[PDB]
Amino acid sequence: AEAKVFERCELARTLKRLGMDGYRGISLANWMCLAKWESGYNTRATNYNAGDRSTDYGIFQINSRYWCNDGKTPGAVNACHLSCSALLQDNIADAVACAKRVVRDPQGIRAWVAWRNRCQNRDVRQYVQGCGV
Ligand code: NA
Ligand code: NA
Ligand code: NA
């Protein structure tokens, strides 16, 4: 769909307001870094994985094979108990609740390869500077 993209500090503010700062020991800057590399802060972001016919949705690009039901991914489990379309909304309460669920699993935020490649162990302070959070 056409993109619906957050202004960086507005996303930082929203996430903090939604309890993401320090959630599972994950700082806001880290959640910010993940959203940037996963979707560029685009809530309407979707990307089809041709291998297992699954799709990643929203600002955090959550996979339909394990977290949300998109009704078109074979052999899936809906661990967030959310329809994937709920992660393609301006209101990110669901995306947040689902992202919180993802990180409660053993690997935490390391679940996202992009976060391991672009964020992990690196200085991420740039993501929250100037946002007043
Ligand atoms: Na603005
Ligand atoms: Na503006
Ligand atoms: Na706000």
Swiss-Prot record:
Pfam families: Lys. It catalyses: Hydrolysis of (1->4)-beta-linkages between N-acetylmuramic acid and N-acetyl-D-glucosamine residues in a peptidoglycan and between N-acetyl-D-glucosamine residues in chitodextrins. Disulfide bonds join C9-C131, C33-C119, C68-C84, C80-C98. Residues 5-133 form the C-type lysozyme domain. GO terms for molecular function: identical protein binding; lysozyme activity. The active site is at E38, D56. Its main location: secreted. Its EC number is 3.2.1.17. Keywords: Amyloid, Amyloidosis, Antimicrobial, Bacteriolytic enzyme, Disease variant, Disulfide bond, Glycosidase, Hydrolase, Secreted, Signal. GO terms for biological process: antimicrobial humoral response; defense response to bacterium; defense response to Gram-negative bacterium; defense response to Gram-positive bacterium; inflammatory response; killing of cells of another organism. PROSITE patterns: GLYCOSYL_HYDROL_F22_1 (PS00128), GLYCOSYL_HYDROL_F22_2 (PS51348). GO terms for cellular component: azurophil granule lumen; extracellular exosome; extracellular region; extracellular space; specific granule lumen; tertiary granule lumen. It comes from the Eukaryota. Coiled coil: none annotated. It is found in: Secreted. It is an enzyme of class 3 (hydrolase). The keyword Signal applies. SUPFAM superfamilies: Lysozyme-like (SSF53955). Lysozymes have primarily a bacteriolytic function; those in tissues and body fluids are associated with the monocyte-macrophage system and enhance the activity of immunoagents. Lysozyme C is capable of both hydrolysis and transglycosylation; it also shows a slight esterase activity. It acts rapidly on both peptide-substituted and unsubstituted peptidoglycan, and slowly on chitin oligosaccharides. It is linked to Amyloidosis, hereditary systemic 5: A form of hereditary systemic amyloidosis, a disorder characterized by amyloid deposition in multiple tissues resulting in a wide clinical spectrum. AMYLD5 primarily affects the viscera, and the predominant clinical features are renal dysfunction of varying severity, and intra-abdominal bleeding. Inheritance is autosomal dominant. Belongs to the glycosyl hydrolase 22 family. Monomer. This is Lysozyme C.
